[PDB]
Nucleic acid binder design. Structure first.
Ligand SMILES: [Mg+2]
Ligand SMILES: [Mg+2]
Length: 342
DNA sequence: CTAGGGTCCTAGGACCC
DNA sequence: GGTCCTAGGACCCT
């Protein structure tokens, strides 16, 4: 009863798109991210910039210290969305068992496929080749019997490569696999796990499930399972969006309600435009606001509400402004909507 | 020197039983 | 003892 799961993942997605559309950027260090003056961070960088240590989520001031010639780009999201739609249509030529995880990646369950003699290895190769042929972008891929191992595997031979993990290979692969490589085990969990001698899946295998449950709740069951190659999550092609948000970090902290209200007046039309694409009548389940203070604490307050409404969002921001906050400066203002259930 | 787009999980009190 | 409301936080993607 062994499934074949492919994880396909575009290489340096945003930057790869900018280099295709402007070949001058191919061999110099580039990165999509907000300027140092906008207090921005790097969304991604090409390999010439990664050589200097430039990484996704790095504050753009640090990126520029490591790489003084870094060329900064704003991002062309319609171009990325277009390439996203294209590769998903390419996925559809091979199976309908497609679960996109983001613009540039997806799981595919090809267990019941009879393309390429039912070979998941050759399906993954054909997909990567077609993507390059039709979009002039490269992709990497991972092949394994379960989701999380396939996703790990797509990182191991990138860029423009793939890696295959068979059932026979799973135990050796797991023994020294660092826990932090598991999707969903992040910095905080890894440091907790490290703090009591759990670094790798092999370490967790020597652990009692009851103790893992007591100490991490349902997460501890996930840890126990993944450390054994257990991952029964099915590829789900029916996931739907649940929220939409629009927020802006200012170049300078604001200290006056007049400034906050002005920001909201610019954000609201954008939130409405994006809601309207997916819900023309603007009917929703909840709406709310977000403030992030100069000390980086953030608060949200949101409530049942039937339909996008600017004045209520201003009103709610006013309360949050007055009630929470206590004289701090504000670096970010956000608006938020929770979508109806169906 | 710290984005903006999101998903999922937890947890207390309210409410319904 | 379920389920809803709400706030916060870890985590994911580029
Ligand atoms: Mg990628
Ligand atoms: Mg990806």
């Amino acid at each position: 009863g062994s499934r074949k799961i492919i994880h396909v993942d575009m290489d340096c997605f945003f930057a790869a798109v900018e280099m295709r559309d402007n070949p001058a950027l191919r061999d110099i260090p580039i990165a999509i991210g907000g300027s140092r003056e906008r207090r921005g961070v790097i969304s991604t960088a090409n390999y010439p910039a990664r050589k200097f240590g430039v990484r996704s989520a790095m504050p753009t001031g640090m990126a520029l210290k490591l790489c003084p010639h870094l060329t900064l780009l704003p991002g062309r999201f319609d171009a990325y969305k277009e390439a996203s739609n294209h590769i998903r249509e390419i996925f559809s030529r091979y199976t309908s068992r497609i679960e996109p995880l983001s613009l540039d990646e997806a799981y595919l369950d090809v267990t019941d496929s009879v393309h390429c003699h039912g070979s998941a290895t050759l399906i993954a190769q054909e997909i990567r080749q077609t993507i390059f042929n039709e979009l002039q972008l490269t992709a990497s891929a991972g092949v394994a019997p379960v989701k999380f191992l396939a996703k790990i595997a797509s990182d191991m031979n990138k860029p423009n490569g793939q890696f295959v993990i068979t059932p026979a290979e799973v135990p050796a692969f797991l023994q020294t696999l660092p826990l932090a490589k598991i999707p969903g085990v992040g910095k905080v969990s890894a440091a907790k796990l490290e703090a009591m001698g759990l670094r790798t899946c092999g370490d967790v295998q020597k652990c009692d499930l009851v103790m893992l449950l007591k100490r991490f709740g349902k997460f501890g069951r996930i840890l126990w399972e993944r450390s054994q190659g257990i991952d029964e999550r099915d590829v789900n092609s029916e996931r739907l969006r649940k929220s939409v948000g629009v927020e802006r970090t200012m170049a300078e902290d604001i200290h006056h309600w007049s400034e906050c209200e002005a920001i909201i007046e610019r954000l609201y039309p954008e939130l409405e435009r994006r809601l309207a694409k997916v819900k023309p009548d603007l009917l929703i389940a909840r709406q709310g606001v977000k403030l992030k203070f100069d000390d980086f604490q953030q608060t949200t307050q949101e409530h049942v509400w039937p339909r996008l409404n600017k004045a209520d969002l201003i009103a709610t921001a006013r309360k949050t402004w007055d009630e929470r906050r206590g004289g701090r400066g504000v670096r970010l203002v956000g608006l938020h909507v929770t979508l109806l259930d169906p």
